[model samples]
Target: RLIYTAGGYFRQSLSYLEAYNPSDGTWLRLADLQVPRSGLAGCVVGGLLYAVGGRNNSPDGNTDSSALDCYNPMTNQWSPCAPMSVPRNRIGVGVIDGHIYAVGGSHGCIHHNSVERYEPERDEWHLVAPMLTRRIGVGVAVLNRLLYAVGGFDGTNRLNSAECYYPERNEWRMITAMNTIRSGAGVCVLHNCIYAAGGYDGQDQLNSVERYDVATATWTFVAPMKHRRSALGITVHQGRIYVLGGYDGHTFLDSVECYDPDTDTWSEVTRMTSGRSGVGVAVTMEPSR
Candidate 1:
């Protein structure tokens, strides 16, 4: 199962809803969130959900925060986790070897390339390897023993840069960028392929989608989404890409779309309860193999 949250109002809130159902193309609301915050990032570890980072309200005068919140699926309850090292938004999170990594978020107007590791066993957070470039609104996913961070804004302008963090090396290395520069896009790993979908180039919402071949370290164009969107909610479940709420340039989107890499095609599923951007999403299982 996968749950999604979206951006809204001054609080930067989270909206709860099912993003996909593999057996059947149906999505249903689970429950409302404990708090209302937006522009957040999230990942699941040991069936527990953790959400972090995002500017409160508007991006122009962003009140970014580094707070962390953990949600328990069994109890359907949420609790406050350790706060991040700094207050920021645009963070990307992935779990590797039982540890959660929070990567790339803005520290005010400045973009940060730092990666923070969360040790759930010790209930603590630690700083790890920093990326080559500072970015915000970036997308991240762990695939085949590596963590991949994709395009986003670099404080001054949008970027299409890409990087990978190897746990074994404790370092970051640059990689091929997307065809277009965008931020607040959807990202996930599906069927051994790293998918980057839907974000803004600072000027307009985008419907374009791309994927990276982990073996070749190159990007391949994929079928575009049905609607242009930014700050989208995304997750991977049962080998399919689940895209939830996001902004479609003129308005926030409540529609949901799914992509099956096997077919390299997209199909609209169901619309979410509300339209929002900067939403966060995650699956019950641990990320990556």
Candidate 2:
């Protein structure tokens, strides 16, 4: 779970949560983040949690950072890791083959196409292939050894195009475009399918949902969300999708929702303790037997 901090000195901090029995709708709290942050990106590599590239302070507006934090649930502690090549907010994160990958984000007026990689064994970051287009708030996930980077903004216009990154060859290839040209949408992959949740269209908030099948290279619409939102966060656990806080365009939200692909239906879940959009999310692995 990812949430924006509210009503505090470090009001920019984002918290991470662990969901238990996700199919049955239960959640648990985990270790706190090292940096009080927001608009962060994350992925799990080698059973350790890695959160990267968010701001340290939001004293003025939208302050972002390039620092990375590593968490070990077993120890309930956090450790500083290698910093990202660029300090950006709203970057896209995914893990493929035990390596952490970060895609486009921004620094001031400059949009980013830099895709950085972190090798766990070395505890360092190395520059990898950059994305074809510069974007922030992109929806990204790894499915079938390929990275699917979905809709986002290029600082001026909302994006409709999507792309795929093949780490084996260290390259990025354009994929089919998305039906909705949007940014800050929630993205996740489950059962070999990639799903994109609510986001903004540069006009109004969205409550829509869509999915792409890796085998067919086709996109399909799922049932809509309970509330219209953008910059929301999503995590796939036990084959179901859980959506956290997002902006309704007029205000921030604390309400949560869940989707069942088996039934093609959505239902309200318990509200989050805090409301925030544009944060990172990941699932926790059960302890080894």
Candidate 3:
């Protein structure tokens, strides 16, 4: 199942939590989230989908939520878990050592470089070493058991900077930055390399993609996506990088695409019923028949 949650910019913010059926290319609605959220991060731990901080666009006004909702696929229900200490918008999430890490995000206009870790056994969130730069709409992925934080807005401008978090040392070390600055780009690991996909560059929605080689500490251009998008859902399944719903500046996109690293090519794949931006994506176990 390619599990994804609700997302939109304004009143369109949805609460629907749905999973895509890879077998038949159909979507199964699970349960609505307790609160509608966008720019939230999703991760699967012990087969459960963890939905972290995101913005709630209410009729009254928009507010960021720190609520941590965990979904049980076995029961097909969503339950609340321990919330983060601070509400985060565009907080990047990654799973390492069976734990969930919530990285840099912003609260209203105040951006943060803070990081938090969740212990499922304890149902608690604890602070970890902060990042070197405050980021909003950051993208993160796990490589070699270390967390790599990619591009995002730093309150002032879109960034191309990248940082590597060392869990063992509780430290964040700067790494070679990308060639193009991006915010809300989808970042994922494929073939042991980090791939940063489409995002906004403060001027226009981006179709550019880059590949980062940790061994060489270098970044190089890859085949660009067919469409310009940001805040898209990114997941790796069957060794291919699957990019899900996102916005393409003028239009919300239901279109989906996938990349083949071996061929260095991207091909159109499945499309969702509705377009989404800032939607969370994670690969999960199949539901019981």
Q: State the C-alpha lDDT per candidate.
A: 0.77, 0.76, 0.87
Candidate 1 error regions (>4 Å): 2-32, 58-62, 285-289
Tens-place lDDT per residue, model 2, 102-207, is: 8888877778988888888898899888899888988888898788889989888899899999887989999888788879899889788899999889998899
Return the candidate ranking by TM-score, descending. 3, 2, 1
Q: List the residue pairs that clash in candidate 2.
A: 13-37, 54-65, 55-65
Q: Kindly report which residue stretches of model 2 are placed more than 4 angstroms away from their true locations once superposed.
A: 1-29, 60-62, 286-289
Q: TM-score winner among the candidates?
A: 3
Clashing pairs in 1: 12-37, 12-38, 13-37, 13-38, 54-89, 65-88
Cα RMSD for predicted model 1? 3.8
Ranking by lDDT: 3, 1, 2
Q: How does model 3 score by TM-score?
A: 0.96
**C-alpha TM-score for every candidate:** 0.89, 0.90, 0.96
RMSD (Å) of each candidate, 1 decimal: 3.8, 3.4, 1.3
Q: Comparing candidate 1 with candidate 2, which one achieves the higher lDDT? A: 1
Model 1 per-residue lDDT tens digits across residues 1-289: 6543433432345445333444555554454555556777877778887777765654345467788878765655678888889876778888898888888887766789888888988889998889888878889888987998899888888889999898889999989888889788888888788889989998888899998888898898889999999988898877788887787767778788888878988898787666767777777732221
